[PDB]
Amino acid sequence: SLRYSRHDGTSCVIDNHHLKSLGAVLNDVRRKKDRIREAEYEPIIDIADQYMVTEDPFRGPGKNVRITLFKEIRRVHPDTMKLVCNWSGKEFLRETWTRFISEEFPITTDQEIMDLWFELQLRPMHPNRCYKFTMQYALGAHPDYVAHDVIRQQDPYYVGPNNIERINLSKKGFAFPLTCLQSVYNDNFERFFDDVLWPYFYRPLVYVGTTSAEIEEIMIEVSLLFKIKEFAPDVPLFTGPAY
Amino acid sequence: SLRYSRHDGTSCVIDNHHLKSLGAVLNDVRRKKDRIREAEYEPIIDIADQYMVTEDPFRGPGKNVRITLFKEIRRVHPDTMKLVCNWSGKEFLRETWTRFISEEFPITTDQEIMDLWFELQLRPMHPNRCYKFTMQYALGAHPDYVAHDVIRQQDPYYVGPNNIERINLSKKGFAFPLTCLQSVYNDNFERFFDDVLWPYFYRPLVYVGTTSAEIEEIMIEVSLLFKIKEFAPDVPLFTGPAY
Amino acid sequence: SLRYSRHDGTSCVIDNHHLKSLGAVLNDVRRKKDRIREAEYEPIIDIADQYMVTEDPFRGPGKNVRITLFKEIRRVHPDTMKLVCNWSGKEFLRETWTRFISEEFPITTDQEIMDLWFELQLRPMHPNRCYKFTMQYALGAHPDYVAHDVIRQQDPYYVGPNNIERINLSKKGFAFPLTCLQSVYNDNFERFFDDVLWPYFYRPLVYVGTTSAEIEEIMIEVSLLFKIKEFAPDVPLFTGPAY
Amino acid sequence: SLRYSRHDGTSCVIDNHHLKSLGAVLNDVRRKKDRIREAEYEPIIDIADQYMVTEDPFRGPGKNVRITLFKEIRRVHPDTMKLVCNWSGKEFLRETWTRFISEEFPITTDQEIMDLWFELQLRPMHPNRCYKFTMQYALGAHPDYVAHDVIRQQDPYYVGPNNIERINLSKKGFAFPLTCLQSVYNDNFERFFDDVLWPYFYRPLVYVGTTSAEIEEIMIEVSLLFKIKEFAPDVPLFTGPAY
Amino acid sequence: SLRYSRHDGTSCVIDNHHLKSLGAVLNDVRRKKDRIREAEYEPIIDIADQYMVTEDPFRGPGKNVRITLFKEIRRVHPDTMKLVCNWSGKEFLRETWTRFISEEFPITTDQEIMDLWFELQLRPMHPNRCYKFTMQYALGAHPDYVAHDVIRQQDPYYVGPNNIERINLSKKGFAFPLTCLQSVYNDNFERFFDDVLWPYFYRPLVYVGTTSAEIEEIMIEVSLLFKIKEFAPDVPLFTGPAY
Amino acid sequence: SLRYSRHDGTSCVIDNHHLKSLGAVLNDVRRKKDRIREAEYEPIIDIADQYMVTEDPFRGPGKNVRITLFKEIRRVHPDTMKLVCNWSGKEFLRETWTRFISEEFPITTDQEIMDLWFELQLRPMHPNRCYKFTMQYALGAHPDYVAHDVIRQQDPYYVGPNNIERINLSKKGFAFPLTCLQSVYNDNFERFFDDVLWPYFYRPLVYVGTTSAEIEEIMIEVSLLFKIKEFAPDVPLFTGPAY
Amino acid sequence: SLRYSRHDGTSCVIDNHHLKSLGAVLNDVRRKKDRIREAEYEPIIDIADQYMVTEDPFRGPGKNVRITLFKEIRRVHPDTMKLVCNWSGKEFLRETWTRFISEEFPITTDQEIMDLWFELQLRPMHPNRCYKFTMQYALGAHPDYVAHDVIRQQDPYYVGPNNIERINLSKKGFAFPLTCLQSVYNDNFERFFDDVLWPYFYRPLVYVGTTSAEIEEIMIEVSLLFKIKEFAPDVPLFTGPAY
Amino acid sequence: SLRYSRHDGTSCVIDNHHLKSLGAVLNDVRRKKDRIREAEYEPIIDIADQYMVTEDPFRGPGKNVRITLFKEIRRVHPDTMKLVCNWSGKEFLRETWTRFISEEFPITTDQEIMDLWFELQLRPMHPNRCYKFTMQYALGAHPDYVAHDVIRQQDPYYVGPNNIERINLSKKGFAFPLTCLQSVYNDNFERFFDDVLWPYFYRPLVYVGTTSAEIEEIMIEVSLLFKIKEFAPDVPLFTGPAY
C-alpha cells in the first residue's frame, strides 16, 4: 500500500541551518501523539492478555494436503438431516490409506502428520435461496450398528460462514499412515490394517441438514485434510554418483 | 489510582434542608447515563457470550516452577532452522527427573503437577536488528533416528511477541516425576526409568530459525516449566514434640 | 433494566485449562478503560466539589402531608396579577389548625413538623394555549391593611416548570400546631390562638398572573404542605391487655 | 503539571527575518480556535448564571476546629435506627463549653464563631460489606421527654458519600461560648449556663441506621465542628517590655 | 436570532398531490431524532431533579435599588486586609435611613423591602496587573470595641468573578426603614432610631485584601442594595378632582 | 414516550430566595445550546427549501377505499414477465363500476373521487427465497390487439420495498363512477357505459416478473384503490320526522 | 468578541454561606478539564518546537513603504511568459533613487532600510476566468545582453494566493539610498550613482505568465517595497526657539 | 513510558495448536487499522511535503557556548524602548575576543564557529504583572553617531514566548575569533583587531521595551552565544611519552 514506506520527506542545509519537510515534521508530531495513546492503552491490553485465542489450524503451522474422497447430492427436508457416509471401519481405513499414499508417493522427506481432519464442504444447487447448513456426527459404534439414513435435527453444529466444517479425527481413535516423525518404509494396506487394534469400530458417521423451512438440494464434497510438518535438510539433490 | 475511592463529596444539613457536593451529584448523573448505556449493550454482550477464550496458563491457576536446563548459541542462515537439542529419550528423562527433584526437595506438601512445558526463550546477540523468531518441533521417533542438524523452513510456528515459546509435553507421552495428587515417597532415577513404558521413544526435538534475510546469532535458554497445584493444610508447623 | 445484573458469562475447565466467556472478558477490558477515565476525571470532580446543591424538600427527607384548602378560578389580564386569598391572620390560623388537626388525628406517634409550605398549584382552563405562570406574595401587614385585588406585574417570581409554587412559611412568623418533637396533648383552637403572640399580623397574601399577552382563565388549588418526621418505636401494637 | 508554564518555544532573527518555534505557532492557532469557541458559549453560560450554588462550608471560608466528643459502637437491625446520644440540655451545654474552651485556650486573637456543627462520622466494622448510612434527628423537646432508643426508618436523611453528616446547630437555639466578634473575658461554666435562656430545652437527639438488609455493626465518632474567623492584627509579638 | 421562527418552507397542491419544502421535511426528521433523544435523557434528568439551585438574587425577583454610600482608596500589603468602614451602629443607621429615604421619596406605592445587602465593588488602579480580591467581615461587637485597621489574611472569602461581593444584612439584626408590606407614614430619623432595640451593636465591619504577592492599590465603592417588591394597583392616576 | 411532557422539575421559595430543580436548569442550558445550533443551520435549510418532495398519496389527504378484484398465481421464468389481466375495455368498466358501486352504496354524503389507482400486491409462495419484483404495463391499444401472455424483461419498473405497486389511472382516459363533487343520482351500468366515449380502448394490461435467476411462484392480489374526499355537513341525523 | 471578558458571574454571602454563579462554576470545571488536556499535549508541542517558521516580512517588524513605479498590460499565450521590464542598470538605479527620495523627503528621523523588495501585483482583465499566475526572473547580466521579450515556461515560480509576488533585492547586489542606521545628508543622483561599484550589471528582469490553456490579458502593477525601521527619540517638537 | 516495549503477550502450543495472547491479537488488528489509515493520509502528507520548516538553531546541530557579558536593569515607559548597550566597535570587539578566548582556552580540538548570536534575555522585576517584551536593533552606523538613549516604539520585534531573543551576527559584518575549520595558533587582541577591516563600524545597538500600559522594571542579561562544531579524532590521550 504505502508507496514511500515511512521515508517521506527530506532534509537540506542552508547557511548552517537545517531544513526538513513540513509533512515529515507533522508526521513526527502525529506519531508522538499516537504513542502517548499506546502508553495509555498498555494497562488495558494487560487485562486482555490474561486470555488467549487459538490460531486457525488451516491458516497456521504445517502444510495442508486435501485428499478429496467423493462427491454426493442430498435433498434434505426441513428440521431433518441426511447421512453423508455409511462405510464400515475397514472401508474407511482402505480409503484413508489408499488415497493418501497413492496421492503423496514418492514421499521424499522426513515428515509427521500433525492432525487428520474430516472435511465437509457444502454448496447450494439453486440460486436465490437463503439458509445456512447444519451438521451432526458420531465417530464409533458397534460394527453391526447401521446408522439411520435420516434423523431429526436436535441441537446440531451450525456450519461456519464459508460452508465448510472440519472435524478432527484424533490419533487416539483413528489410524494414520505415518505415525511419528519418520522416513517411509516399505508398506501395504494389509500390513497397515493388521496393526490397527480396532479396525471395525472407528468410522465417521456424518449428517448434514439446513436451517431452511423448505426442502433444499445440497452438493457435498468430502475430503480428508492432512496437516503435515516436513523436515527437509538444507542440502543439494545431486544426480548420481554425487561428486 | 483513584485517591478518594468513589467516596467523593459529602453532605450537610442547614435548617432541615440537605446539601450535597455538586461534583458528587454530577457523578450520580453521569453514572445513571453510563448504565443506561450498559443496559443498551447487554444484548450485544450476549451474542459475544456464545464464545469463550482460554486463560493464559502461566498467568493463570497453579504455580510456575521454571527448571532451567541449559544455554546455547546458534547462528542461523535465512530460511533455515537449526536443531536445539538432540538427546536420547533416556537422557531427556534423566535431566527431567534429576533437575526437578534436586531443585524441589524437600517437597513438604501434597501436590500435583498439572502440566509440563518445554520452554524456548530466545534473544538477539546484536543490537539494531529487526526480525522475529520461528520454531518447529517433533516429540517422538525411532530411537536410531538421528535428527538433521539443519532444515529448511516450511510453515513454521511463529514465536510470540515476547520471544518465548512453550510447548506442552502431555502426560500421554512424557513421564512426570509426580503423577497424581500425592505425597512424595522414597524414589530414585532407576525406579522412575524402569516404570516408564517407552523411555527411548519420546524426546523433544526442537528447531529455531528467524524471519531475517541475513544470518542472525541467537542466544537460547531452554527450560522445563512445571505448573503445580499444592494442597497445604491450614495447620501450624511445630517444633517436635508438638504440644 | 439489566437482566443479568453484572453476572454475564461463565467459566469452565478443560484439561486443566480455564475458559471464560468472550463477552465477559470484553466487558472486563471495557471496564478497565472506563476506570482509567474515572481516574482522569477525579481531579476535575474535586474542583466541582468546592460547591453544593440543595436537595428538593418534597422529594427529600421527611414525609409530605398535603392539606388541601380550597379551589378558585381567576381571569387575569396581561401584565397584571389577581389576589388569591385575603384572610385575616385569625382566619388563616383557624384554617391551618382546624384542617391539619382534623385530617391527621389520631396522631399516634411522636413527631415534629419540619416545615410548613404554602402551595399554589395552577392549571389552564382552555386547551391550545401557550404561556407560563407568575406569582408575587407578602406575609405580613397592618391588620387594617386590605390588599389590592389586582396589581401590575413588576419583577415577579416565575412559577416552576410543573406549574406549582411552594412558599416556606417560617416558624419565625407562622404558628405550627406541633412545635417541637412531641406527643400530642389535649388541645383546641382557643388554646392555640391564645398562645400565638401576633395572631392578626402574619397571613399569606398571594397573587397569580401569567406571561400571556391575552386574558387567561386559571384554575387554582391552594394547599398547606406539612413536612413531618416521625419517631415510631420498633415495637408491637397489642390488643389490651398486653401479654 | 505544565513544566514550561505557557512559555513554550522561542524566537530569533536571521537577516532581519524573525523566526518563531513551530509548536508555539500551532498553539497560537489552537488558542484562537478555543476562544472562538468560548465566545460561542458565552450566551449559554449567561443562562446558567441565572442560578447559584453554595460553597462547601468546610472547604470554604473560616477555619475548622473539630472538637471530638466521644466514640460509640451500635449494632443496627435493618429498617431501624438507634439513638446515638441522649444527654439533657445541661449535659450537652457542659460538654460544648468545657471541651471547646479547654481545647482552645489560650485564645490569643479576636475572633467570631461563624457556625457550630454536630458531626456524625460513621465506619463499618466488617470488611466485604456493601451498604450506605442513614440519619434522623431532633433538636428540642420537653425536658422530661426521653427519646426512644430504637425507631423505624421513615424518610431519613441519606448520609453523604464520605460517610460524614454535619448538622448545623443554629445560634437561634444553641448557645455558643463566643457570641460575636470579641476578645475573651474571664469566664466559667456557671456564668455561661446562667445566661442561657432555655438550657434544658435544646439538645441534639440523633439516630443512625443503614440501607442494609442485614444487621450491621457501626463505629461512630461524634464531634462538634466550630467554623471560626480570626482578626489577627499585622503586628509583632515582642517579649516584654516592648522596645 | 432565527429569522423564519420555525416557519421555514411551505406547501402546495398539484393534481390532488401535496408538495412540501424539502428543508422543512428534513427538519421534521431531525426533530423526531432530537426527541427520541430527549426521551432517552428523561430518566437521567430525573436523577438530577433530586437537587435544586438558587436563583441569583440580583437577577431574580424584586427590583434592585442601589444606594451608593461612599468611595475609598486602599493600598493593601500582600497577605493582609485593610478595614473599609469603622462607623458606630448609630452612624450606620443614620446613613442607612437618610440615604434610602432621601433617594426614594416620594414613595408612592405599597411595597416591602425583601432584603438589604452590603455591596463591596472593587477595581484595580493600575493596568497590566493580575490578581483577585478577598474579603472578611463581622456584623456586631461591643460598642467600645474598635476594629484593627489591618489584619492578616486567614481563610477569607474570595470575591466573585466580577469583583463584587454582596453581604446579606438580615432583618434579624439590621433595622430596615420599611418593615413589612406597607404604605409610608410620616417618619424621621429620631423616631426610627428610638424604635431600634440595639442601635449601637450591629454595624458591618468589612475588610478587603488581594491574592497578590505585591502591594496593590484598590478603588472601593460601597453601596447598600435594597431588593423591593411593589404592589401597584392596576388603576389610573388622575389630576384632581377625579371624574 | 416522554412521561413528564417537558414539565420536569419545580420551584419553591425560601427566605425570599427562589430555588429551581437542577435538572430543569441543566435542560434550559442544553436547550439554549440546541437553539444556537438551529440558528446556525437555518441558512442551510434555506438552500434545501429551494426544492420540494411529494406527500405519499396513500398516507396523505383523502380516504382510501380498496376494492379488491381478484387473486391469481403465476409461475414466472427468469428474465421474463407474465400477463396479469387481459380484459376488454368493457369488462374492465363493468368490474370498475359494479364492484365500487356495490361495495359503497348507500353513498350518503357528497364526495369526489380524487384518483383511481390500479394496485398490484405480490407475495412469494415459497420461504427462504431472496429476490425482488418487477412490473410493466400499458393502458390502451386497438381493441383487436391481444397482449402476449409472456414477454422478456426490458427496463422494467422495480416494485417498491413492500411489494406493492400502484398505477394511477387518469381521469383523462379512465371513466370514474363519480365524476366531480356530487350527490349520487339514480344510475346503472348501461347508463354509465353509454356515456363513456371510448369504452373499448382503455384497459390496464399489466405484467409481473422478478429479479430471480430461477423460476418463482408468485401470489398476486389485484385491487382498485379509490382516493375519496367527503363533504359531510356538521349536522345531526334524526329519525323522521325531524323535530 | 467576548462581552464579559472572563468576568462572568458573581458571588454573595447569606448567613455566613458563600454563593457563586452556577455558570461561573461550570466554567471553572471546564477550564480544569481544558488544562488537564494542555498538560497532556505539552510533550507533543515539544517535538514540534524542534522546528521554526518565518514571520511574514510584510506583516512583521518594520514599516512598509510602497513606492509604486508603473503599470503595464500584457497578453500572454499559454505556456509562455512575457517580459515585464527591460531597463538598464542605470535606469533602474535612477528610478529607485528618484522615486524613493522624492516620495519620502523630508526624512526627519534616523532610520535604516532593512530590505528592498521588487513587488509584482497581477490582476485579470476579464471576469469569469479561472487560472493562476506564474513568474520567472533574473537579477544580473552582461550590459549588452538584451532579454528575450517572450520565453517558454520551464519550472516557474507559482505566484501566491493573493496574486502578489515580492522578490528580495539583496544589499549585496542592489544599491539602497540609505545604507545603515543614519541621518540624511545632502545628496543627489550623481553622487549616488558614482559610488555604486557595478551600476550597469544589476537590474531585475522579470517575466509573467499563467497556468491558462488560453491567452489571458493581465494588468500588472510594479512597485518597490522598502521595509524601514525608525529610531524616533521620545522628545517634543518645538517651534523655534525652544524654551 | 511503555513498559513492555511492544512485546506484550506470548504464545504456546497445545496438541499441535498454537495459542496467542488475546491482547496481542487485538493490537495486531488495531495496528492493521492504523496503517490502512496511514496509507489513506500518505497523499495528503505529499502536499505538505512541498514545503519545509527550519530546525531551531539552539536545539539543533552544533554545540552551544553561552559567553555571558553583563547584566543591567532598565525602567521603560509605555510605548518606548531604552538602549541596552552603546559600545564603540572596538569595545565590542574587545569584549567578544577577550571573553570568548578567556573562557574557552585551552582549545584542544579542531573546530569551527558556525554562527555568533547576540542573546537578550529578559525577566520582570515585579510579580503579578502581565505584559510581553519587544525589541529593536541596528548593527552599524557612523562611528561618531551616538544612539538615542530612548526611542518610541514603531513596528518592533515581539520577543518570543520564553522572553529570549537571539540576533544572528553575520560573519559578513562581525569578526569571529576562529574563522574556518582550524587549530588555534598563537594570538592576541592586537593581532585580531588589526586584521579586522572595519573595526569601528559594526556594533550591536539594541533596544528593549514592553507591551505594557504602565512603566515596567526589567532585568536584562546580555550574552554572546557561539554555535560550534568540533572535529575530535577517535584517538586516545596519552601521558607523554606515548607508547
Task: Look at residues G15, G215, G226, G16 and name the one whose alpha carbon lies nearest to residue G100.
Answer: G226
F232: Cα separation from own chain's centroid: 23
- The helix, strand and coil proportions of chain C, stated in percent and rounded to the nearest 5, come to 20, 40, 40
Q: Assign residue G224 a region (left: φ > 0; alpha: ψ between -120 and 50; beta: otherwise).
A: beta
The answer to whether the beta carbons of residues D138 and D70 sit under 8 Å apart is no
In 3-state terms, chain A is what percent helix, strand and coil (to 5)?
Answer: 20, 40, 40
The answer to whether D52 faces chain F, any CB pair under 8 Å, is no
Query: Are F214 and A131 within 8 A, CB to CB?
Result: no
Tracing cell 515529515 back to the chain, one arrives at A24
Query: Distance of CA E226 to CAs C99, E115, E233, F237, Å?
Result: 38, 6, 22, 69
Residue D61 identity (one-letter amino acid): P
Distance from CA of A35 to the nearest CA of G (A): 10
Closest C-alpha among A69, A71, A67 to residue A103:
A67
Phi, psi dihedrals of residue A162, rounded to the nearest 5°: -90, 15
- Domain range for residue D37? 1-243
d(CA E108, CA E136): 38
Q: Do chains F and D touch (3 or more CB pairs under 8 A)?
A: yes
Name the residue of chain B whose CA is nearest to C114's CA.
B16
Distance CA B46, CA B44 (A): 5
Phi, psi of G173, rounded to the nearest 5 degrees: -110, -40
Residues of C in contact with A40 (CB under 8 A): 36
Between the alpha carbon of residue A234 and those of residues A62, A113, B150, H54, the distances in Å are: 18, 21, 6, 54
Expressed in Å, this structure's resolution amounts to 1.6
Read off the amino acid at residue D101: I
Question: Is residue G210 packed enough to be buried (19+ CB in 10 Å), middle (13-18) or exposed (0-12)?
Answer: buried
Q: Do C22 and B47 touch (CB under 8 A)?
A: no
Residue A241: other Cβ atoms inside 10 A: 5
Q: Which chain B residues have a beta carbon less than 8 Å from that of D168? A: 12-15
Rounded Cα distance, H174 and H191, in Å: 16
Q: What is the largest CA-CA distance in chain C?
A: 96
Distance CA E68, CA F11 (A): 33
Q: Touching check for A11 and chain B: CB below 8 Å?
A: no
Instruction: Say yes or no: C44 contacts chain G, CB-CB below 8 A.
Output: yes
Method of determination is electron diffraction
Q: Is A182 on the interface with B (CB under 8 A)?
A: yes
Contact A224, A118 (CB under 8 A): yes
DSSP string, A41-94: HHHHHHHHTTEEEEPPTTTSSSEEEEEEEEEEEEEE-TTEEEE-----HHHHHH
- Subunit contact D156:C61, Cβ cutoff 8 A: yes
Q: Across the interface, which of C40, C43, C51 has its CB nearest the CB of G20? A: C51
Instruction: Find the residue in A nearest to B145 (Cα).
Output: A182
User: How far is D27 from D30, CA to CA, in rounded Å?
Assistant: 5
- Tell whether A88 is within 8 A of chain B (Cβ): no
* H6/B117 Cβ within 8 A: no
F152 strand-pairing partners: F80
Instruction: Give Cβ neighbours of residue B4 (< 8 Å, ≥ 6 apart).
Output: C42, D162
Which residues are within 8 A (CB) of F199 and not within 5 positions of it... i.e. 6 or more apart?
F89, F90, F93, F175, F193
DSSP-derived secondary structure for C36-65: HHHHHHHHHHHHHTTEEEEEPTTTSSSEEE
Closest CA to G11 of E132, C160, E66: E132
Local structure of residue D105 (DSSP, 8 states): -
Return the partners of chain A (3 or more C-beta pairs < 8 Å). Answer: B, C, F, G, H
Does the distance separating the beta carbons of E52 and F12 come in below 8 Å?
yes
Cis amide linkage into residue C241, ω under 30° from 0: yes
Cα(C1)–Cα(C8) distance, integer angstroms: 14
Cα–Cα–Cα angle for G223, G224, G229, nearest 5°? 140
The amino acid present at C62, given as its one-letter code, is: G
- The closest CB to that of C160, out of F4, F9, F14, belongs to F9
Q: Name the strands in the sheet holding C133-140, side by side, starting at the edge strand that comes first in the sequence.
A: C150-152, C80-83, C202-210, C133-140, C157-158
Widest CA span in chain A = 96
Interface test with chain H among G181, G227, G237, by most H beta carbons within 10 Å = G181
Determine contact: B161 vs chain H, CB below 8 A. Answer: yes
Q: Taking each helix axis from N to C terminus, what angle separates F22-48 and E22-48, rounded to the nearest 10 degrees? A: 170
Per the CB < 8 A criterion, the answer to whether D18 and D24 are in contact is no
Interface membership of E233 toward C (CB under 8 Å): yes
Counted domains in chain C = 1
Measure the CA–CA gap between A189 and A94, rounded to whole angstroms: 7
The letter for the amino acid at D33 is: K
Residues A127, D119: Cα–Cα separation, whole Å: 79
Q: Extract the C-alpha cell encoding D237.
A: 509579638
Question: Rounded to an integer, what distance in angstroms lies between the CA atom of residue G154 and that of residue E103?
Answer: 85
SS (H, E, C) chain G: CCCCCCCCCCEEEECCEEEEEHHHHHHHHHHHHHHHHHHHHHHHHHHHCCEEEECCCCCCCCEEEEEEEEEEEEEECCCEEEECCCCCHHHHHHHHHHHHHHHHCCCCCEEEEEEEEEEEEEEECCCCCCCCEEEEEEEECCCCCCCCCEEECCCCEECCCCCEEEEEECCCCCCCCCCCCECCCCCCHHHHHHCCCCCCCEEEEEEEEECCCCCEEEEEEEEEEEEEEEECECCCCCCCCCC
Q: B152, A232 in Cβ contact below 8 A?
A: yes
**B28, B38, B40, best to mutate vs chain E, most E CBs in 10 Å:** B28
In terms of Cα–Cα distance, which of G82, G200, G207, G93 is closest to G142? G200
- Find how far residue H159's CA is from the centre of its chain: 14
* C-alpha cell, A82: 441426511
Helix (H/G/I), strand (E/B), else coil: F98: helix
Give strand ranges (E) for chain C.
11-14, 17-21, 51-55, 63-76, 80-83, 110-124, 133-140, 150-152, 157-158, 164-169, 202-210, 216-231
What span, in angstroms and rounded, lies between the C-alpha atoms of E45 and D136? 28
Q: Order across the sheet with C17-21: list the strands.
A: B63-76, B216-231, B110-124, B164-169, H11-14, H17-21, A51-54, B52-55, C17-21, C11-14
Burial of residue E144, with CB atoms counted within 10 A of its CB: 0-12 exposed, 13-18 middle, 19 or more buried:
exposed
C162 to chain F: which residues are within 8 Å by CB? 4, 7-10
Q: How close H28 gets to chain B, by Cα (Å)?
A: 11
Chosen from H28, H42, H176, H229 to mutate, greatest number of chain A CBs within 10 A: H42
Q: Residue C45 is nearest to which of B1, B23, B54, comparing CB atoms?
A: B23
Whether F132 contacts chain A with CB within 8 A: no
Residue bearing cell 538421528: B146
Q: Compute the nearest-CA separation of E44 from chain B (Å).
A: 6
Element (H, E) at D104: helix D89-104
Nearest to D42 among G3, G45, G227 (CB): G3
CA dist B62 and B67 (Å) reads 16
DSSP H stretches of helix in D142-213: 189-194
CB within 8 Å of F39: residues ≥ 6 apart: E1, E2
Q: What cell was used for A46?
A: 494487560
Between vectors from CA C219 to CA C214 and to CA C220, what angle results, nearest 5°?
Answer: 120
Determine contact: E66 vs chain G, CB below 8 A.
no
Strands of chain E (E only): list them.
11-14, 17-21, 51-55, 63-76, 80-83, 110-124, 133-140, 150-152, 157-158, 164-169, 202-210, 216-231
Cross-strand pairs, D121: D164, D221
For H35, the enclosing helix (H) or strand (E) is helix H22-48
How far apart are alpha carbons H56 and G53 in whole angstroms? Answer: 9
Q: How far is it, in rounded angstroms, from Cα H212 to Cα E126?
A: 11
Judge: B152–A234 Cβ closer than 8 Å, yes or no.
yes
